[PDB]
Design a binder for this molecule. Sequence first.
Ligand SMILES: *[C@@H]1O[C@H](CO)[C@@H](O[C@@H]2O[C@H](CO)[C@@H](O)[C@H](O)[C@H]2NC(C)=O)[C@H](O)[C@H]1NC(C)=O
Ligand code: NAG
Ligand code: NAG
Ligand code: NAG
Ligand code: NAG
Ligand code: NAG
Ligand code: NAG
Ligand code: NAG
Ligand code: NAG
Ligand code: NAG
Ligand code: NAG
Ligand code: NAG
Lengths: 486, 488, 482
Amino acid sequence: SDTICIGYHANNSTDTVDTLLEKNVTVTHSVNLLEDSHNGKLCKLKGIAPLQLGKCNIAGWLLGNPECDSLLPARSWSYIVETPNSENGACYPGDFIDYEELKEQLSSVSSLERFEIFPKESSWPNHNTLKGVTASCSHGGKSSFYRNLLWLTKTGDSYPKLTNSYVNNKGKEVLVLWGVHHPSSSNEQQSLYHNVNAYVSVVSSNYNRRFTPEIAARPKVRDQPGRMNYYWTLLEPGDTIIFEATGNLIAPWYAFALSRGFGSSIIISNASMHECNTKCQTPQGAINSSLPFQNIHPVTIGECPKYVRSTKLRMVTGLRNIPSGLFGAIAGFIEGGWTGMIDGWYGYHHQNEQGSGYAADQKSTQNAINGITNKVNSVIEKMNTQFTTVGKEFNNLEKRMENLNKKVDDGFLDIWTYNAELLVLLENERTLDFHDSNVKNLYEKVKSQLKNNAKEIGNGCFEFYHKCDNECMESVRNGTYDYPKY
Amino acid sequence: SDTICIGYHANNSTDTVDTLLEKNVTVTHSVNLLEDSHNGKLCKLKGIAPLQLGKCNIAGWLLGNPECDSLLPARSWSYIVETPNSENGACYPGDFIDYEELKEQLSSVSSLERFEIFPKESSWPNHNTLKGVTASCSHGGKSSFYRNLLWLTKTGDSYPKLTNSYVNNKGKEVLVLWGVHHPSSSNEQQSLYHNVNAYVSVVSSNYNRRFTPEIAARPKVRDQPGRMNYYWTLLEPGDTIIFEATGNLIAPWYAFALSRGFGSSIIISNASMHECNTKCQTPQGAINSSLPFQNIHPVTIGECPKYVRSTKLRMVTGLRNIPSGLFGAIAGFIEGGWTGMIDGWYGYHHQNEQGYAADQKSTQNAINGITNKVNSVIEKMNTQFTTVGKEFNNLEKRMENLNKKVDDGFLDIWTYNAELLVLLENERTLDFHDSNVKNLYEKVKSQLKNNAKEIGNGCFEFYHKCDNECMESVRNGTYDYPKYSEEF
Amino acid sequence: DTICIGYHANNSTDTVDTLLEKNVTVTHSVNLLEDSHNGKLCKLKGIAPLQLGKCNIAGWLLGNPECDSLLPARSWSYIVETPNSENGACYPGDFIDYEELKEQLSSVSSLERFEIFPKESSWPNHNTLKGVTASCSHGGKSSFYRNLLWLTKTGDSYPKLTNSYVNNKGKEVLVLWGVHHPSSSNEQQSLYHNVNAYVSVVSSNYNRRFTPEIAARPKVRDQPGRMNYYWTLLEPGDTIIFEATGNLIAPWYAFALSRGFGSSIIISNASMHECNTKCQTPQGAINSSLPFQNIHPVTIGECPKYVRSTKLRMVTGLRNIPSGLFGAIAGFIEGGWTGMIDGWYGYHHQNEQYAADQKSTQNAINGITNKVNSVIEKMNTQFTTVGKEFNNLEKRMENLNKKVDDGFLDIWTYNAELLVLLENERTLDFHDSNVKNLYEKVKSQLKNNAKEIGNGCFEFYHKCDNECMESVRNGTYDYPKY
Ligand SMILES: *[C@@H]1O[C@H](CO)[C@@H](O[C@@H]2O[C@H](CO)[C@@H](O)[C@H](O)[C@H]2NC(C)=O)[C@H](O)[C@H]1NC(C)=O
Ligand SMILES: *[C@@H]1O[C@H](CO)[C@@H](O)[C@H](O)[C@H]1NC(C)=O
Ligand SMILES: *[C@@H]1O[C@H](CO)[C@@H](O)[C@H](O)[C@H]1NC(C)=O
Ligand SMILES: *[C@@H]1O[C@H](CO)[C@@H](O)[C@H](O)[C@H]1NC(C)=O
Ligand SMILES: *[C@@H]1O[C@H](CO)[C@@H](O)[C@H](O)[C@H]1NC(C)=O
Ligand SMILES: *[C@@H]1O[C@H](CO)[C@@H](O)[C@H](O)[C@H]1NC(C)=O
Ligand SMILES: *[C@@H]1O[C@H](CO)[C@@H](O)[C@H](O)[C@H]1NC(C)=O
Ligand SMILES: *[C@@H]1O[C@H](CO)[C@@H](O)[C@H](O)[C@H]1NC(C)=O
Ligand SMILES: *[C@@H]1O[C@H](CO)[C@@H](O)[C@H](O)[C@H]1NC(C)=O
Ligand SMILES: *[C@@H]1O[C@H](CO)[C@@H](O)[C@H](O)[C@H]1NC(C)=O
Ligand SMILES: *[C@@H]1O[C@H](CO)[C@@H](O)[C@H](O)[C@H]1NC(C)=O
Ligand SMILES: *[C@@H]1O[C@H](CO)[C@@H](O)[C@H](O)[C@H]1NC(C)=O
């Protein structure tokens, strides 16, 4: 007798997916949604190299610590890289006021131009510009000083009241940095500045601060009992800044005209720079991927997959792999799949006097391929790209804000890890049920064509009561079986 | 010859919904969950108009910038509106310390009583109350000053140490504002206050601050090289505030007894006030809606739909529209729907010698389930109540960016939640109808058994004569099979 | 003469909800929401909390004389303030960065209180004896903090003092001090002689100078003076130098800190008991393995996730129908069998001479067990929540913190409730599908050899004994014999 059987695809795949109902289900086709590979290097971003501070931190760079001269030509960058445990910062000990806020400002700067805000040789005619070096800021085995600040002291035995103004005609914000020095004794105050009770005043149209030396016994920091506090402000285009002092001013020498940009950040990384280009950079390495998720690093620059805690995110696209359910066909009354059917997901096996063969049902297969492809793309589309994450740093009196920031990051990460894993589990179950349903619907369509002209053999097969040649088989496969003829 | 067919509804609906598997599925019935329409106007909230500061900001209002006099009678409001056109704040240049914190405080204030904390004519017998006007704060082309502060100066080249106390007897918090003036020269310091080295002290039971004038050369802001810094504190009921000064005090004259309320806020909007009432206000306009979501504005006042970024949220309630699946019936062996069946979702078409009719039982059970599902989804989407604005000064960029990460993160999640739930439930709803049609076909097929031929297209060809009385029996579920096995 | 396929029923009154239906009575279900606690404060992993009682953190660390019972405190698992702690900074003034100090103590597992500047010998040129006050009274006498020392002039001299402490404790040392602000210049001279005094406090990373601000002030607890309190964490090996010409309320005792994990500060009016717990809330301890709880958002230890839900119940069994998407349950098989006590799906036979289908039932049990376990696994336990407090000039931060907490709580309450509703619908459909598949297997195995009644039963044309009935149940039915 001649027979036609309805069955489904199988292959040599060893891909496994999970559902809520079952773990480690081997499937014929699947897609990985989780990027876990990077190149372990620092790369250019959209063709623009980062700024590598190397042995310096942000403080050492912007103040011009003399160990940081290699950073002086710095113009434009795609992101800024601090290395772990930068050893060159504010060499002369003291407090850098609103330092974290300054770093947050630099996080949106794409370029700056360093310029001589107060030319050293001409700006300070009544004061000494030459004696301001210190062993606290040594370089090349000699006492030195910041490149961007100027330690003014008395000339002869006079420190007259100074007043210096700068008008911002750069057409951009100007970052102005200065310092206030705090001697360790009144005699030192007089030796450096003559005036016993001095002050510094710095005023713009939106900045206004006055500083008084606070002289006291202090522990030595790198053998220095003095202190030098550092301050900064953003001078708006067209605005004027006025410095007034009777002592203790560490005057601006160079300042920075800032250009604002999009998508920059400051990261800490021990990775090395290479001649690579990427659209996505993390502190551990660059990512070249189109997947929706990644488990490499929560800190990203550019356009990156969303970070999740997951170790596996795999969506099934094909069928259970059974090479010899909710709808009962796959792994049900059709107990196994057909490795012999290599051209579709669902199809037919026939056996007549002319021979036998496998043929996939193109219509049901292509409709299932279209649905599953839309499902995967729809899932990916809902997982919007992760753009440059903004670093957040807090000082030792901002622990509450630090913990709040951590709670926010941790909470969002919890939710997206849960969303990603759960959606994949649910959709994997639905995808397997979808295939089971398609096999079931295909079987029932063939059963409705043949009616009493064949007996059901139980395994998805029909044993014809007449002879069914290759032309007759094709009629069943394309759905035009002429029942009255037999 | 006589036939009865099982089928499903179709109509002229052009509504489309999406699923994970398919996009733009035309369906017979659906509900929009996303509000995108507003009236473009500012309205009253629960019958109470907002406070429109107009050309003034909060500082100009509370300090009493003379250009803001129309705001002085202000008593109660439902929300506060700043416009992008704020030209009137602190007319005399200076810093307003903790301004953002003050605005945050005002956001929960439903009414204030402006009152004379230190009557000008009696509080300061030893100082000059008349010389304290300035071109920086003009009104009507004449030099003036804040309506709520008093610029005390020396009288007869003397400025004695002043000490003035006020006991809060209002039974509410009292907001007290004052200023400290910083001359641009010692000559000016002496011309105004005589004393070269003055101070201001302001102390309550929980506030304690001392101010020293800082004289220096400064750039002119609005033709003024001096500065005046503004300060405020909340004086608890029963507490006393004591002002002590030897110069430079811009003294409180009027203060504010504050009443706390719920659901108020401060917004920035250039929309206009109209004679309308709403339960939900945004800066772009008021919303009149019961839908769970809206894409009009993240800033809301009152009881509002949840803001999402989505541009379409549509839940299918009916069936795919097929006018002349997981279970194989709809778009399956029953290849199409019936536009002729206008009274239900699933039913029967007959053709005897003597017509569409809906099956009330299967249709009404599906109606209840779909109605329960949509309501359950909507109930899970809790209403959005008044959002609190967040403003930060130029040394709070980190906190500003944290607030933005918080707002963006929640917005991402709810947009994802809303869109995904609709896609998932749309697919299950379509499959639900497919199951229902399938189950009804099998029920009728189980009633008819061998008394009819199964045509395969959802139709049964009767082997006996089936009149309108026989057809009704099939729909009823009361088909008498043995009675017609003998009528072949 | 008959073989029937059917499903389990029992006397369970449990109800679950789906998106489609409310209050569906089901045969088996599992509560995921913990709502019971013991109403007591307990030990955490064997270690008792620090009960501040009538004192707040300030009164404890300053050594408010009403807080003497707290002086030997060494180690604890968490810290408990009670509502309306009436003993704090007895002498009125500002405690600078108080909330930050509390945040620091939230990760402290133990401290060692020690005499940083021995009273009788550290201040040879100043008076250590006159520093008591009615603001800090104890036992009906004027008194003072136990951890600070109110230095004053000796005779009529208050020379410049300089005192240093080197931190040799191998741990961070918490140092506290105060600055006194008299109400008049005469009081300044009576106490400290010097009219214009200052205090300086400097370590390697702290540097602050303080000037007395003398002014008319309202009396707080009959005291018009003020005393402001300051603190710093002195790193191991670092030195702190105090320098003063008056007004210094000197450190007397300081605290060597040991850092720990999972501690916190809570406010609770519950009482301590001789109980041990892995999860503590301010309302009581929790003894539970459930993923969610609605008792309190503030937790210590390893706790179920807090949600606002009032019911979270997952159906595991079937709809209970005693005497659907796939059409079997509550469909052509109109009801369940209370007689079938050994499985979810099975058969009832009736020959001349109940049994559950073990294979489908056990496959259903494994699937449902995996689904419930997978749900709980995705709901990560809630670890110790870190309290957040803000001063009266930090209202924006307080509201931002509240937006975060409320925002996360909304999302987790939504996620938990929705997942349960969705999976409840899928579980019922799962059982419906299984019964249908079992019915379809029996109908295809016995083929035309039995009458198909319509209630899931088949009427045999032949005699089918206990050996034959087992053939149908075992899937080994020999159709050719009939
Ligand atoms: C589901 O069952 C619960 C419990 O029987 C119902 O809750 C009752 O709701 C009414 C509302 O007016 C209250 O008066 C009762 O006190 C509630 N009972 C309990 C025990 O809380 C609920 O209404 C039912 N829901 C539906 C849709 O039928
Ligand atoms: C798996 O099957 C594919 C397709 O038949 C073949 O190309 C590949 O070599 C096979 N690999 C193994 C390991 O069997
Ligand atoms: C680089 O930094 C990472 C992150 O802290 C760290 O785990 C890793 O050990 C570092 N590598 C080296 C060589 O220090
Ligand atoms: C990423 O990998 C693909 C794989 O072919 C390659 O075409 C592409 O150039 C890669 N991108 C980068 C930036 O190297
Ligand atoms: C369908 O099968 C019949 C039978 O062989 C054949 O004649 C006809 O051309 C087929 N049509 C298509 C579109 O394959
Ligand atoms: C459908 O028909 C009704 C009745 O004529 C009409 O009001 C409605 O606009 C029609 N819809 C479309 C899309 O044509
Ligand atoms: C759906 O229809 C709209 C309008 O006809 C069209 O713009 C859109 O591209 C279609 N497809 C999707 C996926 O929205
Ligand atoms: C304010 O007006 C400008 C242009 O006049 C417009 O672009 C902006 O959207 C308006 N703001 C609001 C909140 O409607
Ligand atoms: C708001 O919508 C309702 C819809 O029922 C409508 O009746 C009402 O006229 C609309 N306007 C107001 C002000 O309620
Ligand atoms: C409910 O039925 C079970 C099954 O036998 C029985 O063990 C239990 O005692 C019954 N409980 C009640 C309250 O009827
Ligand atoms: C604890 O405080 C709550 C606050 O509402 C109160 O309801 C409860 O009675 C208090 N318990 C005790 C034991 O004081
Ligand atoms: C905690 O509950 C379990 C049962 O849920 C019980 O066996 C155990 O004894 C309980 N422990 C305590 C300390 O109450």
